[PDB]
């Protein structure tokens, strides 16, 4: 019973865990939805660029360095994976 949108594959407890790491004590139920949408929004930008470098290089395979380059564009550099 897994055939659906994979966004719901992000289980509610997984969110509950992340709020803890950010130090959030108490969470209302309505948070679980926009967090999905907000996170959803975040992917849209990064992959679009990530796709762009790959197809510009004519490559059909998304490689690791393509990720950091796009992440660098949004003002969030990523140490640890190349460059």
Using the rule CB under 8 A, is 54 a contact of another protein?
yes
Using the rule CB under 8 A, is 12 a contact of another protein?
no
* Half-sphere exposure in the Cβ direction for 27 (13 Å, CA): 19
Closest CA to 42 of 82, 81, 11, 7: 7
Count, residues near another protein per rule CB under 8 A: 48
Site string for another protein, 33-52 (x = CB under 8 A): xxx--xxx-xxx-xxx--x-
Smallest separation (angstroms) from another protein to the CB of 45: 10
Q: Which residue in the block uniquely carries the two structure tokens 């660029």?
A: 49
* 40: Cβ contacts below 8 Å, ≥ 6 apart: 7
Breaks in the chain (C to N > 2.5 A) come right after none
Binding site for another protein (CB under 8 A): 5-7, 9-11, 14, 17-28, 30-31, 33-35, 38-40, 42-44, 46-48, 51, 54-55, 60-64, 66-68, 71, 76, 78, 81
């Amino acid at each position: 019973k897994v055939l659906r949108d994979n966004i719901q594959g992000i289980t509610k407890p997984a969110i509950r865990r992340l709020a803890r790491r950010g130090g959030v004590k108490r969470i209302s139920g309505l948070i679980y939805e926009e967090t999905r949408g907000v996170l959803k929004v975040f992917l849209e930008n990064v992959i679009r660029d990530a796709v762009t470098y790959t197809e510009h290089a004519k490559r059909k395979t998304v490689t690791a360095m393509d990720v950091v380059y796009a992440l660098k564009r949004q003002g969030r550099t990523l140490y640890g994976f190349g460059g």
